[PDB]
C-alpha cells in the first residue's frame, strides 16, 4: 500500500482550491478546446506521476526492510511475545496460565531492555535518549512486577486489569515512540545519492515557500470582495500580522479527517461558480475570440500545469476524476458567463454579482485558506529547523514571505511563474527522471511490482511513457510557457510598478 493516498488527496485538494479560484482567467486565455484537452492530459499525467512516486516510495521502503540487516529482530520477537501472551491472558481463566505468561513477557522485556532500539543506533550508550528508553523499560518491568504480585495473591480478575494497564502504557509509549514518517527527500537520498538529494531539497523548499506565498496572497485577493473600505495592501497587512502572530506551530498530523470538510466546501464553491450562470443566463456579448497565437497561449498552460502539483510534493485514477468533475464544468460555465471580460480580472468573483451565495463562497474560501495554511505551515518550518538545527530562531521566518507577497499583490501572473518554474520541475521531471535512473541496472529490474491492470501485456512500457513525458513536460512548460509567464509577469509589474499598492482596485 504505502498509505500515501491521504497526503495525495490533501495536497491535491489545496492545489485544486487555488487553481479553481484562478482558472477561468487562463481558461479564456487558452481557448475552449485547447483548455479542455490540456486539462485532461495534464491530469492524467499527474495521476501517472503520483503512481510512479508511490512505486518509488514503496521500492525504497522495501529495499530498506530487506537489505536492512535482520539484527534488531530480537526486539520484534519480544514484542510479538508480549502481544500473544497478553492475548492469552485475556483468554486465560485460571491462575496457572496467567502467572506463566507473566514470567514469559517479563523475561522478554528484560532481554529487550539491553537491546538498542532501531531508531537511535548512532547515539551514545549514555545518551539521554537511551537513558529515557531504559527508564521506560524499567517502569514497564515495574508494572509487570505489580501485575504478577497481584496474580500470586489469587486475585486473577485484577491481573487482567493490570495487564490492560500495561497494554495501554506500552501503547502510549512505543506506538508514539516507534512510529515515524518518511519524507521523500530521504527516499531520494536512499536511492540515487547525495548529489540528487542536495539539489532536490533546494527545489522542494523553494516550491514550499512559493506555495505558501501564493496561499497568503490568495487571502488578500479574496477578502477584498467582502468589503472595499481600504486597499488590498492594508488587508494584506492585517492578515500578515494575523498569520505571523501564529508563528508557534502546534504539532499536528493526520489531517485526513480534517480534509473532508475542505473537500466538501471546495466542491460547493465550484458548484456556485458553475450554476451561478447556467440558469442565471448572464452570458452575453463576445465570449469566444481566441485562442491567442501570441505566447499568452502558454500563460494558461503553465497555470493549468500548476494543477495536479500537490500530489507529488505531499511526500515532500478516480480521485483525479473527481477533481476533473470539480474543475472542468465550473471553468466552462465561467467562460460562458462573461468570456473575454475576464482577462482584465485574474480572479473569478470579480464579475460575480453581490448575492448571498457569493458571501458564502468568500467565507468558505477564507476558512479553507486558514485550514490550508495551518496544515502547510508544518513542513517548511520543520525543515528550516532541520536546516540549521523555543522560537528564538524561527520567529522572523514570516518576514521574507511578507516582503515577497507585498511586492506581488497579483493572483494570476505569480501563479503562472510558480507553475512554470518550480512545480513543473519538482513534480514532473525530478520524480520520473529519478525513477528511470534508479532502474537503469538490469539487476534492479527484477524486484518491482508488475503492471497492475490487464490493459497492457508488456513490461518494457514504463520506459515508453516515462521516456516521453520527461521531454514533453520540459519543452512545453520550461521551454516556452516559462518564458511567456515571466514576460507576462514583467508586463504586469511594469504596469503597476514595483511594490504595487493595489491590483485592479
Amino acid at each position, epitope marked *: 500500500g504505502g498509505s500515501v493516498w491521504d497526503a495525495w488527496f490533501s495536497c491535491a485538494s489545496n492545489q485544486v482550491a487555488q487553481v479553481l479560484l484562478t482558472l477561468p482567467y487562463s481558461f479564456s486565455q487558452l481557448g475552449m478546446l485547447s483548455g479542455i484537452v490540456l486539462q485532461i492530459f495534464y491530469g492524467l499525467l499527474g495521476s501517472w506521476t503520483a503512481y510512479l512516486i508511490s512505486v518509488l516510495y514503496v521500492e525504497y521502503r522495501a529495499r530498506k526492510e530487506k537489505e536492512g540487516k535482520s539484527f534488531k529482530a530480537d526486539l520484534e520477537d519480544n514484542w510479538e511475545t508480549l502481544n500473544d501472551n497478553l492475548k492469552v491472558i485475556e483468554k486465560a481463566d485460571n491462575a496457572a496460565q496467567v502467572k506463566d505468561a507473566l*514470567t514469559k513477557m*517479563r523475561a522478554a522485556a528484560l532481554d529487550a531492555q539491553k537491546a538498542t532500539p532501531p531508531k537511535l543506533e548512532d547515539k551514545s550508550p549514555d545518551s539521554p535518549e537511551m537513558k529515557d528508553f531504559r527508564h521506560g523499560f524499567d517502569i514497564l518491568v515495574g508494572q509487570i512486577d505489580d501485575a504478577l504480585k497481584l496474580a500470586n495473591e489469587g486475585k486473577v480478575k485484577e491481573a487482567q486489569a493490570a495487564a490492560e494497564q500495561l497494554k495501554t502504557t506500552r501503547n502510549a509509549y512505543i506506538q508514539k515512540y516507534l512510529n515515524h514518517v518518511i519524507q521523500w527527500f530521504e527516499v531520494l537520498d536512499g536511492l540515487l545519492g547525495s548529489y540528487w538529494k542536495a539539489l532536490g531539497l533546494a527545489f522542494n523548499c523553494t516550491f514550499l515557500l512559493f506555495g505558501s506565498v501564493i496561499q497568503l496572497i490568495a487571502c488578500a485577493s479574496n477578502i477584498y470582495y467582502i468589503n472595499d473600505h481600504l486597499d488590498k495592501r492594508t488587508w494584506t497587512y492585517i492578515f500578515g500580522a494575523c498569520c505571523a502572530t501564529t508563528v508557534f506551530i502546534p504539532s499536528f498530523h493526520n489531517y485526513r479527517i480534517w480534509s473532508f470538510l475542505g473537500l466538501g466546501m471546495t466542491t460547493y464553491t465550484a458548484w456556485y461558480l458553475a450554476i451561478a450562470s447556467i440558469i442565471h443566463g448572464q452570458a452575453e456579448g463576445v465570449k469566444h475570440s481566441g485562442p491567442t497565437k501570441l505566447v499568452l497561449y502558454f500563460t494558461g498552460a503553465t497555470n493549468i500545469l500548476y494543477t495536479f502539483g500537490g500530489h507529488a510534493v505531499t511526500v515532500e485514477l478516480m480521485a483525479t476524476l473527481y477533481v476533473f468533475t470539480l474543475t472542468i464544468p465550473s471553468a466552462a460555465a465561467v467562460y460562458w458567463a462573461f468570456g473575454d471580460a475576464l482577462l482584465d480580472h485574474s480572479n473569478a468573483f470579480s464579475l460575480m454579482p453581490k448575492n448571498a451565495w457569493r458571501d458564502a463562497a468568500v467565507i468558505l474560501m477564507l476558512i479553507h485558506q486558514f485550514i490550508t495554511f495551518g496544515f502547510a505551515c508544518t513542513p517548511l518550518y520543520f525543515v528550516w529547523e532541520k536546516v540549521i538545527g523555543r522560537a528564538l530562531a524561527r520567529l522572523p521566518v514570516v518576514i521574507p514571505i511578507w516582503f515577497l507577497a507585498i511586492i506581488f499583490p497579483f493572483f494570476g501572473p505569480i501563479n503562472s511563474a510558480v507553475g512554470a518554474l518550480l512545480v513543473s520541475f519538482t513534480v514532473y521531471i525530478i520524480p520520473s527522471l529519478a525513477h528511470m535512473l534508479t532502474y537503469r541496472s538490469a539487476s534492479a529490474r527484477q524486484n518491482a511490482a508488475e503492471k497492475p491492470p490487464f490493459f497492457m501485456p508488456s513490461w518494457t512500457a514504463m520506459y515508453v511513457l516515462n521516456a516521453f513525458v520527461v521531454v514533453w513536460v520540459l519543452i512545453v512548460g520550461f521551454g516556452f510557457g516559462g518564458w511567456a509567464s515571466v514576460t507576462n509577469f514583467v508586463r504586469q509589474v511594469d504596469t503597476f510598478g514595483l511594490f504595487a499598492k493595489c491590483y485592479q482596485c
Partner: antibody
Amino acid sequence: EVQLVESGGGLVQPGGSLRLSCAASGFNVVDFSLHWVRQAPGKGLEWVAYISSSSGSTSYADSVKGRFTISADTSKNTAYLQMNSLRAEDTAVYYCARWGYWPGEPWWKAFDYWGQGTLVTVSS
Amino acid sequence: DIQMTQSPSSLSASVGDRVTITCRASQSVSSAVAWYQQKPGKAPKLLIYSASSLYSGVPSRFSGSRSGTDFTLTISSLQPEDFATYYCQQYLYYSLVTFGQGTKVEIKR
C-alpha cells in the same frame, strides 16, 4: 562492613515449632527483601520464602506452602519466621539473604550478604 | 517453577589449569544468574552477577558468559584456595529463584 545473623535454631520433635530471626544491624532492612535459602545436609540449595517488608508480598515455596509463617517487623530491623509441622526432610541449615529492590544494580545483584546460618533438625 | 541443570556435577583439575562449568536454563531467562563459591561449612558468597559482570571484592580471574539459555563460568588460574563447591542459580522474580544441583571441584592425584 554490614553483616546479618540468625539465631533460635535447635532440635524439635516432629510437629513442633521454632522462631528464626534475621537481625540486620548497620544497613537497614526496612526497604529490603529478605529470603531464606535452605540446604539439606549434603544436598543442593533450595529457596523457601521471602518477605518484602516495604509493601508485603510474602510468598512461600511449593514444598512449604501452608506451613511456614513469615511475619514482619521494622522497629527491631528484623524479619521473624515461624515454623509449624516440621518433617524429617526439613532437617537442614537455613541462610538469611539480601536483595536490592528492583530496578537497578541494587536489584541486579542476587543474594550477596549471606548470614552465618542456623541448624535445626527433626528426630525422635 | 523453571528448571536448571549443571552438567559437570563433579570435576577435578590441578592448580594452574583453566576450568569451565556450564549451566543450562530450561527457559530463555534474560541473564539474571549468579554463581556462589560455597566453601564447605561456611556461607555461600556471590562471585558473578548478571551472568557477565564480576562482583566487587573478589579476584578478576572469575568471569562468565551468557549464551542463549546456557550460562558458563570460567576460571583462568586455579589457585589452591578456590577448590570449593560452585552453585549456579537464576533469579527472575522475588518468588521464582531456583538453584542447580551444584558442582564440586577437587584436587587431581
